[PDB]
Amino acid sequence: RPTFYRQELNKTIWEVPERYQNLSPVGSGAYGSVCAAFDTKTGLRVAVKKLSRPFQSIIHAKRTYRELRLLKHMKHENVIGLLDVFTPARSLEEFNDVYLVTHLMGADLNTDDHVQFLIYQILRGLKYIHSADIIHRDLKPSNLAVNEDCELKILDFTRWYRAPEIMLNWMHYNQTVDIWSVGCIMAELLTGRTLFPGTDHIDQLKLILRLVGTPGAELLKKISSESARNYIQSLTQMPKMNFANVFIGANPLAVDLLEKMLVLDSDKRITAAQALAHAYFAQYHDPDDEPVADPYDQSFESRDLLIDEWKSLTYDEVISFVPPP
Ligand SMILES: Cc1ccc(-n2nc(C(C)(C)C)cc2NC(=O)Nc2ccc(OCCN3CCOCC3)c3ccccc23)cc1
């Protein structure tokens, strides 16, 4: 048990071990608040997350446990991972706050070579997480860490990048909702503008159908919601657009990979595994270093336990954490 020192950053207090210095507020909000700091034990700059009120409700305590256990299983280059994780209390009774650490990467994702490297790393990071049965569901430029080397990591701190089959609100889509999010990002990189800046769910939907055109008899026969079907079918029939003319001036392999990422039928959208195998990442693909992730247990997701129960479980995770080599 190292020396823990206290300090009031923003409207918040911070009680972290001596080894972390130059605590510089970087961001706060709906999650906890992050501070950039320097790790004298390893010489590296880090990002430290102080989870808000870890266990103020059952949703807070469950969510807490869910972040810790994920990041504790996440070990990939193109995916945020756990350097350290600590707290100032000894014994479960005193356990009140949790802090997380990671490689300070600087800047958020917010040149055909640059969109080539950049996007390749997202799909590489996605295939991995997805291979563990995890779906980001919140993929957007602000959730993509990138250093000056253009090296990019995925994390999770709009509707604009959300998949169609979840604007209407589906109860069980697939992992490719993430692939749609990528296609939206790749389009922003190449053009500079937000593909679908819908002002509302319904608006956003109009926007999306304008480019991709409205559903076919095959897709339509795949929606249970009369409401959802009634909303879509109730929109003026629209011809899908000529992506070529939409993204004129871009490498036609990038245009072609897009056509495969922005398909309304999640059942016919390209997966990450498959995306990496596109000709657009020929200069970067290598099937021998696009790893998958060990098996991830999220059966806990299904249960409803007491806050103290969720709390103990997390206490446990903390103390059983082993730092990377
Ligand atoms: C409940 C919950 C469960 C899971 C998540 N979740 N899911 C993912 C995956 C899917 C991408 C693996 C990632 C996360 N969690 C995070 O992305 N958490 C974080 C966000 C931003 C951070 O630092 C921001 C500062 N930024 C980082 C890089 O350096 C520059 C600044 C963090 C710093 C230290 C520890 C966690 C951080 C989130 C919440």
Short mmCIF file of C-alpha atoms and ligand atoms in Angstrom, two decimals:
data_model
loop_
_atom_site.label_atom_id
_atom_site.label_comp_id
_atom_site.label_asym_id
_atom_site.label_seq_id
_atom_site.Cartn_x
_atom_site.Cartn_y
_atom_site.Cartn_z
CA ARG A 1 0.00 0.00 0.00
CA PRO A 2 1.82 3.09 -1.39
CA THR A 3 1.46 6.61 -0.16
CA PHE A 4 -1.74 8.03 -1.54
CA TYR A 5 -1.95 11.81 -1.79
CA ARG A 6 -5.13 13.95 -2.00
CA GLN A 7 -5.80 16.84 -4.33
CA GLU A 8 -8.83 18.77 -5.45
CA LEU A 9 -9.02 18.91 -9.22
CA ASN A 10 -11.94 20.90 -10.70
CA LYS A 11 -14.83 20.42 -8.28
CA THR A 12 -13.36 17.00 -7.60
CA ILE A 13 -10.93 15.45 -5.13
CA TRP A 14 -8.26 13.00 -6.18
CA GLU A 15 -6.49 10.59 -3.89
CA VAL A 16 -3.94 8.80 -6.01
CA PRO A 17 -0.61 7.02 -5.24
CA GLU A 18 2.70 9.03 -5.19
CA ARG A 19 3.82 7.41 -8.46
CA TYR A 20 1.40 9.53 -10.47
CA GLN A 21 2.26 13.20 -10.83
CA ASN A 22 1.45 16.20 -12.96
CA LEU A 23 -2.27 15.59 -12.66
CA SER A 24 -3.77 17.69 -15.44
CA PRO A 25 -7.57 17.79 -15.89
CA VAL A 26 -8.40 16.82 -19.44
CA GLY A 27 -12.09 15.96 -19.38
CA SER A 28 -15.01 15.40 -17.09
CA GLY A 29 -18.65 14.44 -17.40
CA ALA A 30 -21.07 11.57 -17.70
CA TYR A 31 -18.68 8.76 -16.69
CA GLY A 32 -16.37 10.19 -14.07
CA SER A 33 -13.63 12.61 -15.17
CA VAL A 34 -10.23 12.03 -16.65
CA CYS A 35 -6.91 13.64 -15.80
CA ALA A 36 -3.69 13.33 -17.79
CA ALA A 37 -0.79 12.37 -15.50
CA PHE A 38 2.86 11.24 -15.55
CA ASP A 39 3.89 7.78 -14.26
CA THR A 40 7.29 7.93 -12.59
CA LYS A 41 7.28 4.20 -12.16
CA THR A 42 7.41 3.80 -15.95
CA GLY A 43 8.23 7.31 -17.20
CA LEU A 44 5.08 7.29 -19.34
CA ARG A 45 2.29 9.85 -19.45
CA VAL A 46 -1.06 8.28 -18.61
CA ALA A 47 -4.75 9.03 -18.52
CA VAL A 48 -6.48 8.37 -15.22
CA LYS A 49 -10.19 7.85 -14.85
CA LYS A 50 -11.89 8.44 -11.56
CA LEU A 51 -15.28 6.78 -11.76
CA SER A 52 -17.91 9.25 -10.42
CA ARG A 53 -19.83 7.74 -7.51
CA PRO A 54 -18.88 4.07 -8.33
CA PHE A 55 -21.74 2.68 -6.28
CA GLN A 56 -24.49 5.24 -5.67
CA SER A 57 -27.12 3.05 -7.32
CA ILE A 58 -27.38 -0.51 -8.68
CA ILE A 59 -26.89 0.83 -12.15
CA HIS A 60 -23.81 2.74 -11.06
CA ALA A 61 -22.36 -0.27 -9.30
CA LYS A 62 -23.20 -2.63 -12.12
CA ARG A 63 -21.80 -0.27 -14.74
CA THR A 64 -18.68 0.22 -12.62
CA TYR A 65 -18.04 -3.56 -12.48
CA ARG A 66 -18.71 -3.77 -16.18
CA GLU A 67 -15.99 -1.25 -17.11
CA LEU A 68 -13.40 -2.75 -14.84
CA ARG A 69 -13.95 -6.29 -16.12
CA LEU A 70 -13.83 -5.27 -19.77
CA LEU A 71 -10.76 -3.13 -19.71
CA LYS A 72 -9.22 -5.86 -17.63
CA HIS A 73 -9.76 -8.32 -20.52
CA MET A 74 -8.86 -5.83 -23.24
CA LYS A 75 -5.38 -6.50 -24.56
CA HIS A 76 -4.94 -5.24 -28.08
CA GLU A 77 -2.97 -2.43 -29.64
CA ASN A 78 -5.95 -0.85 -31.32
CA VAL A 79 -8.03 -1.04 -28.17
CA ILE A 80 -7.66 0.81 -24.88
CA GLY A 81 -6.19 -1.31 -22.10
CA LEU A 82 -5.48 -1.33 -18.38
CA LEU A 83 -2.07 -0.21 -17.18
CA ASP A 84 -3.13 0.11 -13.51
CA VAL A 85 -6.28 0.41 -11.41
CA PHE A 86 -6.31 1.43 -7.77
CA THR A 87 -8.28 2.89 -4.85
CA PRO A 88 -7.40 4.52 -1.50
CA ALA A 89 -9.28 2.11 0.76
CA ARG A 90 -8.16 -1.11 2.44
CA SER A 91 -10.83 -3.63 3.33
CA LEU A 92 -14.15 -3.82 1.52
CA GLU A 93 -15.89 -1.58 4.12
CA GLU A 94 -13.77 1.45 3.15
CA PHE A 95 -14.09 0.75 -0.63
CA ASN A 96 -15.82 3.81 -2.14
CA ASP A 97 -13.96 5.07 -5.20
CA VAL A 98 -12.23 3.51 -8.24
CA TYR A 99 -9.50 4.99 -10.54
CA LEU A 100 -8.41 3.56 -13.87
CA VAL A 101 -5.25 4.13 -15.85
CA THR A 102 -4.16 3.86 -19.42
CA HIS A 103 -1.54 5.10 -21.95
CA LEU A 104 -2.13 8.80 -22.44
CA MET A 105 -2.62 8.89 -26.21
CA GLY A 106 -3.53 12.56 -26.68
CA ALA A 107 -6.20 13.80 -29.08
CA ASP A 108 -9.31 12.10 -30.53
CA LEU A 109 -9.85 11.19 -34.15
CA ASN A 110 -11.97 14.28 -33.92
CA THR A 111 -4.90 11.72 -46.96
CA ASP A 112 -5.78 8.41 -48.57
CA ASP A 113 -2.82 7.03 -46.74
CA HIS A 114 -4.05 8.47 -43.49
CA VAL A 115 -7.63 7.22 -43.91
CA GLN A 116 -6.06 3.93 -44.90
CA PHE A 117 -3.99 3.50 -41.79
CA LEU A 118 -6.55 5.10 -39.55
CA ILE A 119 -9.49 2.98 -40.63
CA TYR A 120 -7.45 -0.20 -40.83
CA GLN A 121 -6.67 0.20 -37.11
CA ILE A 122 -10.31 0.64 -36.20
CA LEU A 123 -11.32 -2.59 -37.96
CA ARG A 124 -8.28 -4.33 -36.42
CA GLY A 125 -9.39 -3.05 -33.05
CA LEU A 126 -13.02 -4.10 -33.81
CA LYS A 127 -12.41 -7.64 -35.02
CA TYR A 128 -10.71 -8.21 -31.72
CA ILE A 129 -13.33 -6.83 -29.34
CA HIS A 130 -16.09 -8.37 -31.50
CA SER A 131 -14.30 -11.72 -31.41
CA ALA A 132 -15.01 -11.60 -27.65
CA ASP A 133 -18.74 -11.03 -28.23
CA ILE A 134 -18.58 -7.34 -27.42
CA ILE A 135 -20.29 -4.65 -29.48
CA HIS A 136 -19.12 -1.09 -28.93
CA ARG A 137 -22.47 0.45 -29.87
CA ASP A 138 -21.08 3.95 -29.22
CA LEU A 139 -18.46 4.26 -31.96
CA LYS A 140 -17.83 7.86 -32.95
CA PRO A 141 -14.71 10.04 -33.62
CA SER A 142 -14.67 11.19 -29.98
CA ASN A 143 -14.24 7.58 -28.92
CA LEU A 144 -11.13 7.04 -31.00
CA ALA A 145 -7.77 7.91 -29.36
CA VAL A 146 -4.91 8.74 -31.76
CA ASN A 147 -1.33 9.87 -31.00
CA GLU A 148 0.98 12.02 -33.14
CA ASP A 149 2.24 8.85 -34.73
CA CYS A 150 -1.28 8.37 -36.12
CA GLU A 151 -1.44 5.23 -33.92
CA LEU A 152 -5.08 4.74 -32.92
CA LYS A 153 -6.88 3.12 -29.99
CA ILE A 154 -10.59 2.58 -29.46
CA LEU A 155 -12.42 3.47 -26.28
CA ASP A 156 -15.85 4.70 -25.12
CA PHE A 157 -15.99 7.97 -23.25
CA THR A 158 -24.26 11.07 -31.52
CA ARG A 159 -27.00 9.25 -33.43
CA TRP A 160 -25.20 10.53 -36.51
CA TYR A 161 -22.98 7.44 -36.65
CA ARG A 162 -25.55 5.04 -35.33
CA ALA A 163 -26.72 2.12 -37.42
CA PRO A 164 -30.12 2.29 -39.09
CA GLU A 165 -31.45 -0.82 -37.31
CA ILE A 166 -31.11 1.02 -34.00
CA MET A 167 -32.51 4.47 -34.74
CA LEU A 168 -35.83 2.70 -35.08
CA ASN A 169 -34.70 0.90 -31.94
CA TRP A 170 -34.09 -2.82 -32.29
CA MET A 171 -33.99 -5.24 -29.34
CA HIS A 172 -31.37 -7.57 -30.81
CA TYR A 173 -29.26 -6.52 -33.82
CA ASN A 174 -25.75 -7.80 -34.64
CA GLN A 175 -22.16 -6.61 -34.18
CA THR A 176 -22.13 -4.89 -37.59
CA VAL A 177 -23.94 -1.89 -36.10
CA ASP A 178 -20.33 -0.98 -35.35
CA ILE A 179 -19.39 -1.45 -39.01
CA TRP A 180 -21.98 1.16 -39.96
CA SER A 181 -20.39 3.55 -37.47
CA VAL A 182 -17.03 3.02 -39.17
CA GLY A 183 -18.45 3.64 -42.64
CA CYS A 184 -19.74 6.95 -41.32
CA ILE A 185 -16.38 7.88 -39.89
CA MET A 186 -14.41 6.87 -43.00
CA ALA A 187 -16.75 9.10 -44.98
CA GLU A 188 -16.03 12.04 -42.69
CA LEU A 189 -12.28 11.58 -43.01
CA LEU A 190 -12.35 11.50 -46.77
CA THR A 191 -14.73 14.44 -47.24
CA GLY A 192 -14.49 16.54 -44.14
CA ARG A 193 -18.27 16.56 -43.61
CA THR A 194 -20.63 14.56 -41.43
CA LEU A 195 -22.40 12.01 -43.55
CA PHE A 196 -25.62 11.89 -41.49
CA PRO A 197 -26.16 14.93 -39.24
CA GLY A 198 -29.74 14.00 -38.39
CA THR A 199 -31.30 16.38 -35.84
CA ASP A 200 -33.43 13.61 -34.48
CA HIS A 201 -33.93 9.91 -34.67
CA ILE A 202 -36.60 10.22 -37.31
CA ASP A 203 -34.65 12.95 -39.10
CA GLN A 204 -31.46 10.93 -39.04
CA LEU A 205 -33.37 8.07 -40.64
CA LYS A 206 -34.51 10.25 -43.53
CA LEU A 207 -30.90 11.35 -44.03
CA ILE A 208 -29.68 7.77 -44.17
CA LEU A 209 -32.32 6.51 -46.61
CA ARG A 210 -31.49 9.33 -48.95
CA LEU A 211 -28.08 7.96 -49.75
CA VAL A 212 -28.80 4.32 -49.41
CA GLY A 213 -32.31 4.65 -50.79
CA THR A 214 -35.37 3.11 -49.10
CA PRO A 215 -35.65 -0.67 -48.21
CA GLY A 216 -36.50 -3.45 -50.61
CA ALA A 217 -39.24 -6.04 -50.29
CA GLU A 218 -36.56 -8.33 -48.92
CA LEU A 219 -35.51 -5.99 -46.12
CA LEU A 220 -38.95 -4.69 -45.27
CA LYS A 221 -40.13 -8.26 -44.69
CA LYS A 222 -37.57 -8.30 -41.86
CA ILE A 223 -39.04 -5.69 -39.50
CA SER A 224 -41.53 -6.70 -36.81
CA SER A 225 -42.39 -3.22 -35.65
CA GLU A 226 -45.46 -2.08 -37.60
CA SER A 227 -44.49 1.30 -36.29
CA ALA A 228 -40.97 0.98 -37.69
CA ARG A 229 -42.24 -0.54 -40.95
CA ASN A 230 -44.99 2.11 -41.07
CA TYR A 231 -42.45 4.87 -40.65
CA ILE A 232 -40.05 3.63 -43.39
CA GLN A 233 -42.65 2.53 -45.93
CA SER A 234 -44.39 5.83 -45.22
CA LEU A 235 -41.40 7.76 -46.61
CA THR A 236 -41.16 8.70 -50.29
CA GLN A 237 -39.50 5.86 -52.16
CA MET A 238 -35.90 6.86 -52.81
CA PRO A 239 -33.30 5.49 -55.23
CA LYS A 240 -30.05 4.51 -53.54
CA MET A 241 -27.30 6.95 -54.64
CA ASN A 242 -24.24 6.62 -56.89
CA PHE A 243 -21.52 6.56 -54.14
CA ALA A 244 -19.10 7.22 -57.01
CA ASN A 245 -20.72 10.63 -57.53
CA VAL A 246 -21.19 11.04 -53.78
CA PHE A 247 -17.51 10.57 -53.00
CA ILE A 248 -16.03 11.64 -56.32
CA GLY A 249 -12.28 12.09 -56.14
CA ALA A 250 -11.59 9.31 -53.70
CA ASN A 251 -9.73 6.05 -54.29
CA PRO A 252 -12.28 3.70 -55.89
CA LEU A 253 -11.28 0.95 -53.42
CA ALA A 254 -12.26 3.16 -50.56
CA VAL A 255 -15.50 3.91 -52.36
CA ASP A 256 -16.02 0.21 -52.81
CA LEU A 257 -15.34 -0.66 -49.18
CA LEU A 258 -17.90 1.97 -48.22
CA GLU A 259 -20.63 0.44 -50.36
CA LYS A 260 -20.08 -2.69 -48.34
CA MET A 261 -20.16 -0.92 -44.97
CA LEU A 262 -23.23 1.21 -45.54
CA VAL A 263 -25.82 -1.44 -46.36
CA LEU A 264 -29.22 -1.18 -44.64
CA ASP A 265 -29.57 -4.97 -44.13
CA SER A 266 -27.30 -5.77 -41.19
CA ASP A 267 -27.50 -9.30 -42.63
CA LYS A 268 -25.58 -8.26 -45.68
CA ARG A 269 -23.10 -5.80 -44.17
CA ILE A 270 -19.40 -6.53 -44.24
CA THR A 271 -17.90 -7.67 -40.96
CA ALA A 272 -14.64 -6.43 -39.49
CA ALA A 273 -12.86 -9.66 -40.20
CA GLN A 274 -13.98 -9.31 -43.82
CA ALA A 275 -13.23 -5.57 -44.02
CA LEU A 276 -9.56 -6.11 -43.16
CA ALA A 277 -9.52 -8.44 -46.11
CA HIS A 278 -10.46 -5.59 -48.43
CA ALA A 279 -8.20 -4.38 -51.20
CA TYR A 280 -8.33 -0.93 -49.60
CA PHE A 281 -6.03 -2.03 -46.77
CA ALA A 282 -3.67 -3.95 -49.02
CA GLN A 283 -0.79 -1.77 -47.87
CA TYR A 284 -1.58 -2.68 -44.24
CA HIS A 285 -3.38 -6.04 -43.95
CA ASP A 286 -1.51 -9.07 -42.51
CA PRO A 287 -3.68 -11.99 -41.33
CA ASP A 288 -0.98 -13.08 -38.93
CA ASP A 289 -1.27 -10.01 -36.72
CA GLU A 290 -4.93 -9.20 -36.58
CA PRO A 291 -5.48 -11.14 -33.32
CA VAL A 292 -8.76 -12.21 -31.75
CA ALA A 293 -9.51 -11.98 -28.02
CA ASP A 294 -9.57 -14.68 -25.39
CA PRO A 295 -13.05 -15.78 -24.28
CA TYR A 296 -14.93 -13.01 -22.44
CA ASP A 297 -17.44 -13.79 -19.70
CA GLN A 298 -20.40 -11.46 -19.63
CA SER A 299 -23.01 -13.76 -18.14
CA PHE A 300 -23.00 -11.25 -15.28
CA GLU A 301 -24.76 -8.90 -17.70
CA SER A 302 -27.89 -10.97 -17.24
CA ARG A 303 -28.31 -10.76 -13.47
CA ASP A 304 -29.65 -8.14 -11.08
CA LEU A 305 -27.70 -8.15 -7.83
CA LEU A 306 -27.55 -5.87 -4.79
CA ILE A 307 -25.23 -2.82 -4.91
CA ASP A 308 -23.06 -4.35 -2.20
CA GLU A 309 -22.85 -7.54 -4.24
CA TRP A 310 -21.88 -5.68 -7.37
CA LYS A 311 -19.51 -3.75 -5.11
CA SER A 312 -17.82 -6.73 -3.56
CA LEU A 313 -17.33 -8.30 -7.02
CA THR A 314 -15.52 -5.21 -8.18
CA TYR A 315 -13.50 -4.88 -5.02
CA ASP A 316 -12.31 -8.35 -5.92
CA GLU A 317 -11.39 -7.35 -9.49
CA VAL A 318 -9.30 -4.49 -8.17
CA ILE A 319 -7.14 -6.60 -5.82
CA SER A 320 -6.70 -9.40 -8.35
CA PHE A 321 -5.38 -7.02 -11.04
CA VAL A 322 -1.93 -7.77 -12.42
CA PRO A 323 -0.10 -5.05 -14.33
CA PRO A 324 1.25 -5.67 -17.83
CA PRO A 325 4.95 -6.55 -18.34
C1 LIG B 1 -19.30 1.31 -18.14
C2 LIG B 1 -18.33 1.24 -19.26
C3 LIG B 1 -17.93 0.03 -19.72
C4 LIG B 1 -17.02 -0.03 -20.75
C5 LIG B 1 -16.53 1.07 -21.30
N1 LIG B 1 -15.61 0.94 -22.26
N2 LIG B 1 -15.71 0.06 -23.34
C6 LIG B 1 -14.58 0.21 -24.01
C7 LIG B 1 -14.24 -0.45 -25.10
C8 LIG B 1 -15.40 -1.23 -25.70
C9 LIG B 1 -13.74 0.45 -26.26
C10 LIG B 1 -13.14 -1.49 -24.88
C11 LIG B 1 -13.80 1.13 -23.41
C12 LIG B 1 -14.46 1.56 -22.33
N3 LIG B 1 -14.00 2.39 -21.39
C13 LIG B 1 -13.28 3.50 -21.59
O1 LIG B 1 -13.01 3.92 -22.73
N4 LIG B 1 -12.88 4.18 -20.53
C14 LIG B 1 -12.12 5.25 -20.65
C15 LIG B 1 -12.43 6.24 -21.48
C16 LIG B 1 -11.57 7.34 -21.57
C17 LIG B 1 -10.41 7.36 -20.82
O2 LIG B 1 -9.57 8.35 -20.90
C18 LIG B 1 -10.00 9.46 -21.67
C19 LIG B 1 -8.78 10.35 -21.93
N5 LIG B 1 -8.14 10.20 -23.27
C20 LIG B 1 -7.55 8.86 -23.35
C21 LIG B 1 -6.23 8.78 -24.13
O3 LIG B 1 -5.32 9.75 -23.67
C22 LIG B 1 -5.84 10.97 -24.09
C23 LIG B 1 -7.14 11.27 -23.37
C24 LIG B 1 -10.12 6.34 -19.98
C25 LIG B 1 -8.94 6.34 -19.18
C26 LIG B 1 -8.65 5.29 -18.32
C27 LIG B 1 -9.51 4.23 -18.26
C28 LIG B 1 -10.69 4.21 -19.05
C29 LIG B 1 -10.98 5.27 -19.90
C30 LIG B 1 -16.91 2.31 -20.87
C31 LIG B 1 -17.83 2.41 -19.83
#
